[PDB]
Amino acid sequence: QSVLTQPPSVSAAPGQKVTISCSGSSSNIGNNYVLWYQQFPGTAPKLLIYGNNKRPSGIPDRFSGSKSGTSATLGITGLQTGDEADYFCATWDSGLSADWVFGGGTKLTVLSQPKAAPSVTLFPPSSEELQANKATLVCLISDFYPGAVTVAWKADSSPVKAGVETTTPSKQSNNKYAASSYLSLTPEQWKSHRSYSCQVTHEGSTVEKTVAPTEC
Amino acid sequence: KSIHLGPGRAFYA
Amino acid sequence: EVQLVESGGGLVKPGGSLRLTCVASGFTFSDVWLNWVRQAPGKGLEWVGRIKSRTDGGTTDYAASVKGRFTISRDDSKNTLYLQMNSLKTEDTAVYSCTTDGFIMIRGVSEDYYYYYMDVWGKGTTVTVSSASTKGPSVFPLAPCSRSTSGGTAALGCLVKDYFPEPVTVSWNSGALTSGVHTFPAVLQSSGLYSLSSVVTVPSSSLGTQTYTCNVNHKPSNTKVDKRVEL
Do C89 and C163 share a domain, yes or no? Predict the structure, then answer.
């Protein structure tokens, strides 16, 4: 659900380098010229790259862009803490309306502290709520760094997409991150499965909690 | 001579 | 002081209309092409349409997702761009921004190249297409399914469900309790309503020593709720 596909998150320490990929079709990246923008919170996007690989004046050679086929890549070397920002690719469409089109964005973390795995707490629906003819399972994710996770839900160990709503990650007052995921079901659905799991994946590692209706 | 690279732009000018 | 400033955003019922305006300053507005773009919460940027400059014919282009419903017009004499949105759908909900098409020109050995890009961006105006209206929260206790006893810590809390608009304020034991309290950002459901959770961590061994009551305050609906959480 973004015309051009980027990874949601990338990170490395100061001094290091990083690449951010952007995947499209023949009709955007394939035919046309790719642009890259840097955006800070609250601030207008700044042009970083145009014409696939050209830097505006003031953009240092640490930033570089390339394109091949239907993908484009942005490279950043000698990472500075000042580079921590969102990066997104843009090009246009070759169709009748020639839309500008965008990547979903990549948040780059410049590592200033050790990676922290998320603390995860999973709550069942309350007795009160079930009597209100509703059921929400509540999965609370905190204290992770860098600030990106992906959340998967299971019922009787099989994937559940329906009735799921997850927040974006948010900065805690201590510079780590928090997120929340809500699985909404009917009381009768609730009572129908043996277990339910909230599985949070952070930096290749997954932390999971489970509940079973039978305890409650 | 002017070349125009953007959406909706007349390449040539 | 080159700038674009949008206004006109607000809450609108599905099937409704709304007109946004964008005011330009600090540059020759009539010389440039302009775009409307929009971004839903947790989603990527999406182009809505453009209108070209008078010299380039002044015509409009629209995204397939809004063509027939949205109309873009400019008033060069008032440095103003408009977006008239009709038959609004819940899925049109977004922060809508205006942008210019700028360029970098490279003087070639014979011939000049023009690389265009969205240059000046406004800060945006929020459009909410929803049937939701002011509503105070339902509040439910959060306790573990498994008896959370012996050993380390226990988590307990309050689920603050289905309110509109933001914000809600949650305190614990009238503000006496602050240690181990974590209130999370709200999730927006497809109904248009928010829900959030607030949790408290305590030593498990300590569990029946005292009480825990969350004090939920919803100023927009003038609702307050105090709820004891028993584990």
Answer: no
